[model samples]
Target chain A: PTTFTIHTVESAPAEVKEILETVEKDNNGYIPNLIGLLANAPTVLEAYQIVSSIHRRNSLTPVEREVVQITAAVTNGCAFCVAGHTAFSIKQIQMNDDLIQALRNRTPIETDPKLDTLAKFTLAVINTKGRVGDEALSEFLEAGYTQQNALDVVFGVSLAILCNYANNLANTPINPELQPYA
Target chain B: TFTIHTVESAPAEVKEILETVEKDNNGYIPNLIGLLANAPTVLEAYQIVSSIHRRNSLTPVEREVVQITAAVTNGCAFCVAGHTAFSIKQIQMNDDLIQALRNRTPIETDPKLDTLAKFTLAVINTKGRVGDEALSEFLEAGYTQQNALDVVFGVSLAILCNYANNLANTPINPELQPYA
Candidate 1:
């Protein structure tokens, strides 16, 4: 029973309260349940924040980053991440439906070639087991993306992999705020 | 003093795990592990992330390549030294590759390994910018985009250990002295 409990700023361990406060503040004064569950351990919460910052600060444009994340969430099968990132993509990144729908459905972004390339490349990394052979690399390069962006796609995947793994591990439920997206 | 705990002296929560690892490693618990146990907050996350790294498509040698790269890049002497020894003794890593990783130089004998090293460095140096040219080089070198992401996982795992050990000022244990 103690294993999967959610910890709020008030209910969390003393070490975790400050982080919860910060999370709540960042999340428009509502700490999402995923974070609250992660607050079960300080370093898990801290590691999540650190990797989240890494993904956010990486070279990919905001749109491109979201594409990588959405692709990961969908491919990795984390409904929580898929929904949460969907909402973030819509509201925060201001992503269009073509982008969001393509990502959610694991389909191509026909309306946007660059992002479609990014989405395909993201899947190639996952599906091909990192062997994303020469043709895919060539196509990505031809699409006007640098090798950095290709690996930047990898960075984005790292973040998504972390979030998706943790969320699934904890069985983090979608909070009310994410209902529509879910 | 950051208490360098022994198995018996460590927290009860980690005692079984510590005991098992000590036995698994032939009765030697690393100073880094002992020092890190002083902060239980560090272990589970690290264990989880480290396990995640182990499951990646990367071969054992390639995985160590990313690890040594991150250890070198992060300037964690304990990890660099320990992993170097682990590479030599456990993985039977070749001298040319081991020395190249230690020196932060190119591994001339193996282009793929060398490219992987450069790719890891790019991830760190660019903070994941990994530039157009650098990434293309990685892809061109028979590496996958998946391997690139696995590099990030390796770096993160290394960061957890390296940063924790560094903060604890973990001394190199006697067994790792040769590599150190």
Candidate 2:
């Protein structure tokens, strides 16, 4: 199969061209390939933006949200997302290197107890398709996350699945800025 | 323990959203929405994405076919049962189509719908790495490339509800249980 093109603002459909231009503006004049590919169906891109914004509005800090993305992307085996999110986690969020390594490697995060618990819990959620065991949920709670926080993780998972599956289907290419992480 | 919040117990914003759902869906709040009310953001996001998905390019029956296919592929009984019910009762989708979905049987009668089901199942089972054959068959069956992309929105909706139901272990409402 031919690779899916990354749609430029001028090349996208009328319904999506304006949105693509906005996305390009938001991302420093270059729309990420993920968003560009999703522009093929403007409604999908629009819905993704809505759900993704809502996920960000949840109680998780930026770092915690990245944890959700990494976990879900790793489980889904979406290299594009894992690379992009890993870059964001490190460069933008200033996450600890050891923890980022742990997320990428799928190993125990020994550097930070709080993030370790969150990673384990996230792994459980993904591995079980959201049927997280009570022990895992309790561990996350005991580590200072509330029930609301657990649901916040769910929100992040929902958003991640959208991007992960999108990239997986389109074979979305990692942005050049994120290629080092890949 | 996670609680499936009732309207009275939900957050102020969530309660308002629940009221809207009640008013819109014939004075009934679906269990899936009730479960999502635990996280106001999830419920709010769901409503937005769902409404967008509902109004997309797919016909009502075609949309139901995608919903049923995703729900079944995800093993989300709540969604499968609920969509099956809606497909039959509201859209009046042919019973044979619903049965084919439930049985994991290849639909032979309606070639377009059959392509849709097959494509949907391939996406879910492959975690979005749908093979070229599936994509080609889908396009050949009269679906545009945009339709393939729109299918992602439908899959997103299904996963949102399916994974929520998985974590919440939400019970099937009586009306929907018969479809199960």
Candidate 3:
């Protein structure tokens, strides 16, 4: 199916339409391709809503979540999600300059142990099969995270992979603001 | 410095090999291969493993935790710690369940232990997919419909870990898996 189908929120099932409208109002346009593809399942939109709420409730900071998003998107090579989520990272979170640069370069930008741990973990998550060893996890925990943080990161990986794969199938285009990324 | 092999785009070639492997092995390689290979296979082993989780009807958190642990257990050295670490963060997993899963033991609570036991068996025998009895057991235990979808997500997580570690050939990190 074509990416960027520009689906109307009203056309979808109730939850989907509601979510599409929510995304529109919140993100300042219609739902993009990933949401559209998820609309196929209808319930996926509800799941996204619940999960997104939980993501906010979870201990992961906005920057942390954005970092996870960037890592997964880049690793999966999903241009649309990479661009869209990157746009949010830049525009919504107002990510610090260094973090943005790191995202752009696909390089580590932070010295903060937590961020550093996640950055490294992100690479491992991307490069390996979610099999990074105890040393890597211990390093993160030592950096002050808890076991819950680790599980959330895996969930974040799930979101990233799903969105990336969906975007890949849809051939979604990069959002305008994110065109600056190589 | 070591000269890098011309097989630099190993993901692409790995994808092809995985396809061939599945044709021979009777199932696709894991989705981790998509993460691993350039030209990635859609019918990956990850997909099959994930299907098992879905078809078996696991709870989301329960399922994710299982795969997250496998990733950790296998160490796939580069991936396990991170993914497992992330799993802990996402699920708000109870210490008991996490500990039990890490230990590969049946959880202490009979109800949870029953589920955990089945999950362990599924991870080991079915590659994350359990048989009908396993699903019946979960339903018998009173997991909700949400739990069913969680199973799908869980399968996806395990398959991803299995596939990626398989490709990365990462060593399982003991410290990461830890003792319950």
Candidate 4:
């Protein structure tokens, strides 16, 4: 196993503590490592949260969010996120390992064509930066996603990209407690 | 790809690139990508060309000025205007230094812009097997080797902007495009 120069969530700023207070009540005291990095720029932290919260409000099933995030992690090759998110998907979102692996592999896990559309398109968006054309996008829309979902997909991809880039910068560490997945 | 034959000057492929731009930015890619849209091949090439920063080793701010320098040096009136505006937001750059960098003139007392000028030209000249020494001046001025690399990244990303505006003859979009 390769050891990474771990950038933990402990470096979070004072305002970050307050931001965490907003949602930390639900989870344990621990904030995600990605948030800790955002503490470096409070304004960016605020923008990310506001934009992401709007995305959550506008579109995505919990499952869809999981797939998009996981796919981005896989593409970016971030071991830290790959491990933690796998557990979150199974424990919180009720997605299993097989499905998680499939999504990570950029292979669709669900048989339902609509969800399948989300899986394929999310992978495509992560791989190609908003470059997908009418042919590929038409499949998702034709499969029943609204045009609003396209913007939502952009939101998801953009957020994941933010995390992917940050994780690379911070050299985010994998949670020790999380079991290793192949 | 929606190719409009109505625009007599634009070739067929350039029109498709415009359609794709409209799709991504939601009608915000402006007339530049639109006119060049006839060359779908070149427009597709734009993504690879411009993404050099994202795909390479450039720092966020360094990438900003590479675009800024190209706009300034090429004397592309629209690019100079647009890049100058975006570069202002790209990094929280100092006004005095920015003026010097744009003019390709010396900032008499300021060491920062002086080194930045060298790096800016390094980008314009494509680094062309340039050695490490060319970079030392900028690195000595408190910028890291990584920052130097990021400067290169900025140069590469600027490739997209300069090319887009130049090839399409796209006028500068309205003054305010969102900052990074």
- The candidate that wins on lDDT is 2
Worst 10 residues of 2 chain A by lDDT: A1-10
| lDDT by residue for model 3 (B1-180), tens | 101111233444344555564464345332233233332222232344344444444555555555655554554444445445435665566767665665666666656645754654453343323445665566567764335334434534554455444433544334334421
- Comparison by TM-score, 1 against 3, better one: 1
iRMS, model 3 (angstroms): 12.9
| Local accuracy of candidate 4 as per-residue lDDT tens digits, B127-171 | 212345555566677765335434443543344344334422445
TM-score of chain A of 3: 0.85
TM-score of chain A of each: 0.93, 0.92, 0.85, 0.81
Q: Which residue runs of candidate 4 sit more than 4 Å off their true CA positions? A: A1-12, A21-24, A177-182, B1-180
Deviation from native of the Cα of residue A147 in model 4, angstroms: 2.0
> What TM value does chain A in model 1 reach?
0.93
lDDT of each: 0.73, 0.81, 0.55, 0.55
Q: For model 2, what is the error of residue B66's alpha carbon versus the real structure, in angstroms, after optimal superposition?
A: 1.8
Stretches off by above 4 angstroms in model 3 are: A1-6, A175-182, B1-180
Each prediction's TM-score versus the true structure: 0.54, 0.94, 0.51, 0.54
Residue pairs that clash (backbone atoms under 3 angstroms), model 1:
A130-B144, A130-B146
* Candidate 2 lDDT: 0.81
Docking class of 3: incorrect
Indicate whether candidate 2 or candidate 3 has the larger TM-score.
Answer: 2
**Residues A38-127, model 1: lDDT tens digits:** 665555566677666655655578888888888988887778888998899999988788779888998978888988888998887756
Give RMSD to native, each candidate.
16.8, 1.8, 17.4, 11.4
What fnat does each of the candidate structures reach?
0.00, 0.67, 0.08, 0.00
